[PDB]
Design a protein around this ligand. Structure first.
Ligand SMILES: Nc1ncnc2c1ncn2[C@H]1O[C@@H](COP(=O)(O)OP(=O)(O)O)[C@H](O)[C@@H]1O
Ligand code: ALF
Ligand SMILES: [Cl-]
Length: 414
């Protein structure tokens, strides 16, 4: 922000623009379920076209293909199709993001042309670490990583970064494009401004709700969050990693993070030290396979979860507790659903939680729900204008909350 180059200060007339966007949208059965993330990036894309930009080249990622190409699953071609509609302009989709063939198309396009490169996470050089065919985690070669970044840089004359949602990751698209002028997009600015107002001087008590399925990544955030919040609800897939360590509970086939489990005790003790109330689930709704149409089951912390069964939602007694926390708080940040909201058997808990968050905003409490899947709850239940702010980044928003500057923003020009 503030001392870094921005799109409004940028000159794009006659120049090709390579733009990093967060088009990592929710997919069901190969089709889009929400387009906010896409819709949010349009102002920046149009700006360039209206100001006489020769082309706009769009780079983004979908899901976690672990460095291997999966066009059948994690392809960006359907995206791509929505963009035309929001765009009102013909969009051209390429089956790779590199190089000589792709560089050919991007080398000097026809005026007003926008190009969607293929998914970046098909290459190990983005992250750059990944899984091979074995499922063996591997890392990309330093030299190759660096060739990857030189490839992107032929795609445009100026670089614009609008991907607030991935701004917290130091990947090759985010920090690697070497161009003389690297400018932050409007989404980046709109979002960064909003959070400078919200954090820096939070209304208290301040509560942080944690959920979702990305356990391994999101526990590492907690520790620095403990210094900035008053209360924490930790539900969703996170919950089981905590409960097995803390109470030697039995969690069945539920998500578990082993590395995360090594820090659970310390995290509790720092919460005590700082007096942050940690709220966890006391009962769950269970399933025998990972399916919409699985057989349902009931469980408690005391009861444990039966072998080969998994907890995909939180029980009614658990929702009762969360709701006590919500009522106390005057600012709330929520990332990650507490259950699998997409499937009707497991959307009970998440629905209840949102319902409470909406009342909270009525009494003047400030509510931020951020994240690609957690945002989709709002769209599904039409609570988008009922909450104080709905944000495009979830993990990214939490990383602002810790105090570290974002890799994406630190890499912008000064
Ligand atoms: N145990 C579980 N297993 C699978 N999905 C779960 C889950 N618990 C909750 N969910 C729900 O959490 C969602 C995880 O999405 P995430 O990317 O972490 O949230 P973000 O984009 O950061 O805001 C997933 O779609 C499912 O609806
Ligand atoms: F899927 Al996220 F924050 F991790 F939107
Ligand atoms: Cl993760």
């Amino acid at each position: 922000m503030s001392n870094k180059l921005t799109l409004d200060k940028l000159d794009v007339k006659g120049k090709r623009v390579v733009m990093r966007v967060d088009f990592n949208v929710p997919m069901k059965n190969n089709q889009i379920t929400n387009n906010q993330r896409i819709k949010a990036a349009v102002p920046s894309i149009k700006f360039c076209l209206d100001n006489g930009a020769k082309s706009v080249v769009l780079m983004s990622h979908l899901g976690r293909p672990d460095g291997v190409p999966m066009p059948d699953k994690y392809s960006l071609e359907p995206v791509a199709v929505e963009l035309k509609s929001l765009l009102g302009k013909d969009v051209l989709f390429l089956k790779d993001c590199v190089g000589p063939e792709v560089e050919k198309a991007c080398a000097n396009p026809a005026a007003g042309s926008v190009i969607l490169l293929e998914n970046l996470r098909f290459h190990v050089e983005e992250e750059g670490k990944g899984k091979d065919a074995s499922g063996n985690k591997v890392k990309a070669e330093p030299a190759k990583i660096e060739a990857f970044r030189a490839s992107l840089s032929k795609l445009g004359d100026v670089y614009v970064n609008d991907a607030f949602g991935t701004a917290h990751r130091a990947h090759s698209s985010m920090v690697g494009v070497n161009l003389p002028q690297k400018a932050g997009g409007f989404l980046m600015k709109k979002e960064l401004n909003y959070f400078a107002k919200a954090l820096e001087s939070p209304e208290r008590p301040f509560l942080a709700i944690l959920g979702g399925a990305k356990v391994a990544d999101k526990i590492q955030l907690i520790n620095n969050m403990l210094d900035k919040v008053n209360e924490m609800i930790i539900g969703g897939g996170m919950a089981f990693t905590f409960l097995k360590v803390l109470n030697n509970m039995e969690i069945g086939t539920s998500l578990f993070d082993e590395e995360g489990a090594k820090i659970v005790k310390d995290l509790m003790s720092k919460a005590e030290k700082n007096g942050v109330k940690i709220t966890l689930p006391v009962d769950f709704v269970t399933a025998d396979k990972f399916d919409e149409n699985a057989k349902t089951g009931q469980a408690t912390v005391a009861s444990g979860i039966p072998a080969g069964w998994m907890g995909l939602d939180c029980g009614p007694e658990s929702s009762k507790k969360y709701a006590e926390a919500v009522t106390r708080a005057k600012q709330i940040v929520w990332n990650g659903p507490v259950g699998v909201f997409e499937w009707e058997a497991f959307a009970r808990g998440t629905k209840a939680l949102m319902d409470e968050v909406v009342k909270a905003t009525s009494r003047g409490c400030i509510t931020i729900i951020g994240g690609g899947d957690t945002a989709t709850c709002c769209a599904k239940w039409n609570t988008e204008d009922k909450v104080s702010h709905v944000s495009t980044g979830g993990g990214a928003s939490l990383e602002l909350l810790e105090g570290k500057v974002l890799p994406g923003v630190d890499a912008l020009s000064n």
